[PDB]
Each structure stands twice: as structure tokens, then as C-alpha cells.
Scaffold this active site. Structure first.
Site, PDB file in Angstrom:
ATOM      1  N   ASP B 267      -9.092 -14.412   1.598  1.00 52.19           N
ATOM      2  CA  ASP B 267      -9.567 -14.117   2.958  1.00 52.19           C
ATOM      3  C   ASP B 267      -8.394 -13.585   3.761  1.00 52.19           C
ATOM      4  O   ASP B 267      -7.253 -13.968   3.521  1.00 52.19           O
ATOM      5  CB  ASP B 267     -10.084 -15.367   3.670  1.00 52.19           C
ATOM      6  N   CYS B 307     -18.368   4.352   2.220  1.00 53.87           N
ATOM      7  CA  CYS B 307     -18.964   3.648   3.350  1.00 53.87           C
ATOM      8  C   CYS B 307     -19.708   4.576   4.304  1.00 53.87           C
ATOM      9  O   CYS B 307     -19.511   5.789   4.287  1.00 53.87           O
ATOM     10  CB  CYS B 307     -17.931   2.802   4.098  1.00 53.87           C
TER      11      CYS B 307
HETATM   12 ZN   LIG Z   1     -15.020   4.494   4.657  1.00 54.48          ZN
END
Ligand SMILES: [Zn+2]
Ligand SMILES: N#Cc1ccc(CCNc2nc3cc4nc(N)[nH]c(=O)c4cc3[nH]2)cc1
Ligand SMILES: N#Cc1ccc(CCNc2nc3cc4nc(N)[nH]c(=O)c4cc3[nH]2)cc1
Ligand SMILES: [Zn+2]
EC number: 2.4.2.29
Lengths: 370, 370
Positions: B267, B307
Site C-alpha cells: 500500500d 486507462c
Molecule cells: Zn493512463
């Protein structure tokens, strides 16, 4: 689709519902335009803006000419590509924001020179050019928003200058072939709160001829009663067959009353700005989610709202986010408020189409102000 | 699915890839956990966090006990329902954040009393209770993160206290039937940079018995060379058949090297925090989007990244947003950075599964640091 076509499908009193067809899409009227001043509707992806029901958004000549720059946006392919919104965009002309936000201004018949909130210039010609560089679909004439209150003499002198600037705006727009063929141009009525000046302004704009007509010079501190009084005589002065756009309005009740008076289009930063500040709109009136009473309230922001925020998160969670200064709080409040505004516009359109808008207005007010 | 089952599907050297099955979902390992300190992964809806590929997120006992409060979250139905994330959540125990963030602290064998950044208390028993109230799926033992540097004597005394606290954590967890039946408990190895103390700590934790084992006390200023040196001897001390969790790590190269040394879980606030500050991760190393060189760059943040941000918006637009302080800038940078981290984890998992992780690590470093 054509460059521009406004069709009225149904009427009730002075209220109208219909559509504006443009190359980049259809706009359902009466329409609310979310505001995206700096090439973003604050805290929302453009897909989210669209999901709430928005057909068109507003951008600002003033802010964008300062940052990131109009020439820069053109070099990058225009505002639509830059921010990722492929539907119509209306841009204000700068005439209001320069006087609202600039530290120092020099006004003349040529236009306005000002200091950035760097020295800059606006004029009818430069304003129309900037809106071209941005690739705006609805271009606003460069005008002067007369301060309120104004004496009749000052209001008249101001309005007369705006009408000269409206002609210059028309000519600049028409001189640019690609712009004239692909965008629309709206004129802006001035004249403060004075019926005779409003009539002179309407006559001047109609003589020039525009694709739509805005009521300028309102929402400048006059209050609802006075705004409504001015709309009562001002809107019927505009050509009936073109859209009527009330600039900078407003609260849900302002919108309902303005539609009752013949307005077809609205923009306002209220739902976005006040959302970030914790104010949520509901059918039972606004609430401030920061209030301690919401800390353990599991209900959604509004009990009927169909938005994604009200489907998933509680008042208690959003209260926590806004109290903590969390970005997701701004995101959720903003999406709900914009969705609420779009749901209001949909109910207005549907009720006019069904000839029950007067009843809707009455029922809306009784509950919103209970 | 069972309460907890860790299965190793493939290995290469010390590196492993596999899955943790829990009631609320499957976690693919090696795993990166986005951090959601105050019941939100900053600037992202939980659906967006999931869309990037995250299987599990981290929350914090310390922050949540202060605001909105653990008892309050329980009254509202638990952290999952509260924030709208229905998959596994790991919660840190407070042992690190209290000493990092509190203005005044009083440490004793019982636990820590502290002032909120209001007087509060943490202990093994209260920490486990808070994590129960939150409804955490992976509960961390309450420990003491020894400051760096530490003398061997101070490191030993600190580690010994943490091992006593680990037993108290185990007993508190087991005493609560619903928690013991539905959640997992991880112990935390301490001992600073000292091999003998790390061995004593590992032995103590294994004697108690946990579902997973964290390497604590690192990423506290020691630097990568030293961190890697300590991992070299520390990870093999932990039970091979349970997950190994490196707390608070880290940069992409830290993660790759830690996986080479047997770590399964990570994390770090780096991708979220630095995203909001304008740092974007790319396969050719980090960039700062604020830099003037990006003002007219039409390429996406990274040329290969899959993304949604890289599919739609340019460096130039994101540059403008971050320079302007726009919320959408924080949103887009954060989504890309978290997605980049998940893509890194996927490439790590795939390369281990195919027995080509050593080559991936070499190729990754050559390009990232070119
Ligand atoms: Zn990206
Ligand atoms: N939150 C909030 C909030 C902040 C401000 C306002 C008032 C906006 N009023 C307003 N905008 C206008 C824009 C305008 N643009 C132009 N070019 N001309 C106008 O006469 C004009 C008049 C306006 N009146 C309303 C809500
Ligand atoms: N941006 C940014 C950024 C900020 C801080 C850090 C360092 C984080 N290091 C770190 N977190 C930890 C949490 C921990 N929690 C517990 N309970 N115990 C630890 O020993 C421990 C050790 C840690 N070391 C890394 C990146
Ligand atoms: Zn809603």
C-alpha cells in the site's frame, strides 16, 4: 443537422418547449447550461455532465483568453477536443466577466482594456475572434452589462453603446466564413429596469437580426420581484420565433418563474459552486449537508432524485466528505445538484408539453417553500 | 468463498503469484492497495477505483476513529456500506499513524494516549475493536513502528513490546466471534534493520499464528538500498505459505524489487498524493505535468497506458487543469496513477506466471531509469 434551427413544439401562456438543432447536437428547451468557465464543469468529467441530462454547457471568453489562452486552444484543436465535450458549447463574450473580475479596466467606444486577475484587450471584434478560436457553437455578442442600480440616462448611454457593439459583433461573425456557416450568434438586450430602453434595445437587435436573443443586465442584485417585473415586459419584445436566453439565472424558483415569462435557456454557477460549499437542492428546498443533523442520516440527498449519487450514497457519508474537505464530496454534491437542475428542466418541458405547467409551477412552489 | 485462503499458483526465485480468497472477494497477488484513509480514495468514486483493477483498498484506524468515528460508522452499517466499496478492505491498526500525526502522545505498555491533530486512546484491544466496528476484512495487529535510525537496544525493546501487543491483538480478535469468523488477522514484524531482532520477531509471530505477515518498520527514511538489504534476510523468516505484506511501499521500482524479495502485498499514498501534486507515472519514469513543456503536448500521460484518462485527454489539458487548481485535474491524475500501479501489478503477476519476471524486472528498470 442544420447550423441552427429552433422549433417550438408546445406552448402554455408565455411558456414554450421545443428544440434547437445544431451540428453538434440537439438542445431541448427550456434548457439549463452547466457552467464550465475554465474548460471544465468543476469536479465533473464531461461524461458525467452528459449523464445528468445536459445538452449544452457554457464556457467563458474572459477566463479562457487568460488561461490557457484562445490561440493555444485553437492550436490544440479547439475547446471541444481539448476538454472532451463533443456537444454544443455556448460562450459568453467577456463583456460581463471583465467588469466583474478585473482589477483595473479602461472602457471606451472601442472596447475594454484590463489587467488580469498582465494587460489584455476585448472588443466586439476580438471577442468574436476568441469565440471562433475556441470553436464555440453559440457565440454571444460583445456587450456591456449595465451596473445596478442605474439612472435612466446612464442606462440609456450604456444600452446604446451595447447596440453599436451588437452590430460590430454581427459584422465580425459574418466576415468569418467558417464561423458563420457552423456557429450561431445571439444578441443581448440591455436597458436596465426601464421599459422604454428595453424596447429600444429589442428593436435594435431585431433590426440587426440574430439566431437568438438574450436578456442581459439582470441577476445583478435587483432581486426576484424586480427581475420578474422586468421580464414581464421585456421578453415579449423579443422575436417570438427565436430562443430567449436569461443570462446568469438562477435558483430553481427563478427558473420556473422565468419560464412562465417566456425564457427558453439558462446558465448559472449556483448548482456547481454551492454544491462544493455543501448546499444540496431538493424538492423540499435546499439543505446544507454540513449541518450536524445530517451526520447519521442514511437517506439520500433527495428522496425522489434519480441521480447516481442518490442511488448509492447517504447524506451521512456526503456530510463526512464535505466536513473533511474531501474532493469526492465536491464531486458527489456537484453531480447531484446538476442532475437536480436537469430533472427540474425535464419536468418543466414535460408539463408544458402536457398543458399542465401552471399547475406544476404552483405545486413546485408550495413544496419547495413549505 | 472461505473466510481466508491464500494459494500460490506460480513462483520464480523468491517471487510468488497467486490469490487470496475472502468472503467479499478475490485478491490477486502481488497486490497493490490504493489508500482510502478517510473512507475515500481521494478524488475517485469506488467504481473508478475498481475499474483501474484494484481488488482491495486500505483504510486507517487512526483517521477514522477521529472522523467520522468508529462507533458512528458501525451505527451506519459499517465502512463498506458507508463509502460504497463492497470488496475487501484492509485497515492499518493505528500504531504508525498516531506517532506520525498526533501533536502529543503518551506511550506505555498499555498502549498510546494522544491528542487529535481532543484526547484519545489506542491499545491492542481498542484497535482491534475499532477495526471490528469498521467491518474491516483484513485486520492489522496493533504495533509500534520503531523510528529510524534506532540503536540495537532501543530496537529490541520496541520489538519486544510489539510482540506482546501482537499476542494481545490475537486474543482480542479471537474473543470476538463475528470478527474471528469473517475477517483475517495479520501480524507485523519489527526489529528495525537488525537481522537477529527480525528473526526473533518472525519467530514470535509464527508462534502466535496469523493469517498473513507484514514487514513493518520500513519505508521510514532508510532508503532503497537499506530497505532491500533488510528484506533480503527478513522475508525468508516469515511463513512461506501465508501472504507477505510490505507496509507503506512504494515507488514502482521499490515494488518490483520487493516482489523479487518475496513480498505479496503493498500500500502507498504515493500514486494518489503525488497525482494531486502533478506527478504522473509513466513507463519512461515519472513526469511533472505542471512543467511548461507539456502546455501544448497532445500525447496522453503515458503512450501505452490503457486507462480511461489516457484514452481521452491530453497532457496539455491535464497540465492546464493542474496549473489552474481544478478538481478535475486531481481526478484525472489520480485515476491514471492508480491505473498505472495496477498495470504494473498485472505485468508482475503475468511475468511470474510465465517464468519471465527476472527479465521483466531488468527491462522495466532499463526503460524507467533511461
Ligand atoms: Zn493512463
Ligand atoms: N453561486 C452563485 C452565483 C453567482 C453569480 C450569480 C449572478 C450571475 N448574473 C449574471 N451573469 C450574467 C452574465 C452576462 N453576460 C453578458 N455578456 N451580459 C450580461 O448582461 C450578463 C448578465 C449577467 N448576470 C448567480 C449565482
Ligand atoms: N507521498 C507519499 C508517501 C508518504 C509516506 C510514505 C512512507 C510510508 N511508510 C510506512 N508506512 C507504514 C505503516 C506502518 N503501519 C504499521 N502499523 N506498522 C509499521 O511498522 C508501518 C510502517 C510503515 N512505513 C511513502 C510515500
Ligand atoms: Zn440526486
Amino acid at each position: 443537422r442544420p447550423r441552427f434551427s429552433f422549433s417550438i413544439a408546445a406552448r402554455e401562456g408565455k411558456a414554450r418547449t421545443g428544440t434547437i438543432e445544431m451540428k453538434r447536437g440537439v438542445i431541448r428547451t427550456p434548457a439549463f447550461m452547466p457552467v464550465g468557465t475554465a474548460a471544465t464543469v468543476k469536479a465533473l468529467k464531461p461524461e458525467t455532465v452528459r449523464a445528468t441530462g445536459a445538452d449544452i454547457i457554457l464556457g467563458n471568453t474572459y477566463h479562457l483568453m487568460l488561461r490557457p489562452g484562445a490561440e493555444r486552444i485553437a492550436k490544440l484543436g479547439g475547446l471541444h477536443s481539448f476538454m472532451g465535450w463533443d456537444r454544443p458549447i455556448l460562450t459568453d463574450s467577456g463583456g460581463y466577466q471583465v467588469m466583474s473580475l478585473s482589477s483595473l479596466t479602461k472602457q471606451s467606444e472601442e472596447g475594454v482594456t484590463f489587467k488580469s486577475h498582465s494587460r489584455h484587450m476585448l472588443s466586439p471584434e476580438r471577442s468574436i475572434e476568441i469565440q471562433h478560436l475556441l470553436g464555440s457553437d453559440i457565440v454571444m455578442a460583445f456587450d456591456e452589462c449595465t451596473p445596478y442600480p442605474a439612472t435612466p440616462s446612464r442606462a440609456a448611454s450604456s444600452m446604446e453603446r451595447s447596440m453599436r457593439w451588437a452590430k460590430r459583433s454581427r459584422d465580425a461573425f459574418d466576415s468569418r466564413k467558417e464561423q458563420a456557416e457552423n456557429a450561431a450568434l445571439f444578441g443581448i438586450q440591455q436597458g436596465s429596469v426601464f421599459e422604454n430602453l428595453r424596447q429600444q434595445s429589442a428593436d435594435a437587435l431585431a433590426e440587426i437580426g440574430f439566431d437568438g436573443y438574450a436578456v442581459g443586465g439582470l441577476a445583478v442584485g435587483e432581486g426576484q420581484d424586480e427581475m420578474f417585473r422586468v421580464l414581464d415586459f421585456s421578453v415579449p419584445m423579443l422575436p417570438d420565433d427565436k430562443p430567449h436566453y436569461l443570462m446568469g439565472v438562477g435558483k430553481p424558483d427563478d427558473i420556473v418563474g422565468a419560464v412562465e415569462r417566456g425564457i427558453d435557456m439558462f446558465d448559472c454557477v449556483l448548482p456547481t459552486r454551492s454544491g462544493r460549499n455543501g448546499q444540496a437542492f431538493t424538492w423540499d428546498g435546499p439543505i446544507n449537508i454540513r449541518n450536524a443533523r445530517f451526520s447519521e442520516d442514511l437517506k439520500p440527498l433527495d428522496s425522489e432524485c434519480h441521480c447516481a449519487v442518490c442511488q448509492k450514497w447517504s447524506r451521512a457519508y456526503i456530510h463526512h466528505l464535505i466536513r473533511a474537505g474531501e474532493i469526492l464530496g465536491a464531486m458527489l454534491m456537484t453531480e447531484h445538484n446538476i442532475a437536480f437542475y436537469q430533472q427540474l428542466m425535464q419536468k418543466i418541458r414535460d408539463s408544458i408539453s402536457e398543458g399542465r405547467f401552471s399547475q406544476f409551477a404552483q405545486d413546485f412552489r408550495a413544496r419547495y417553500f413549505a
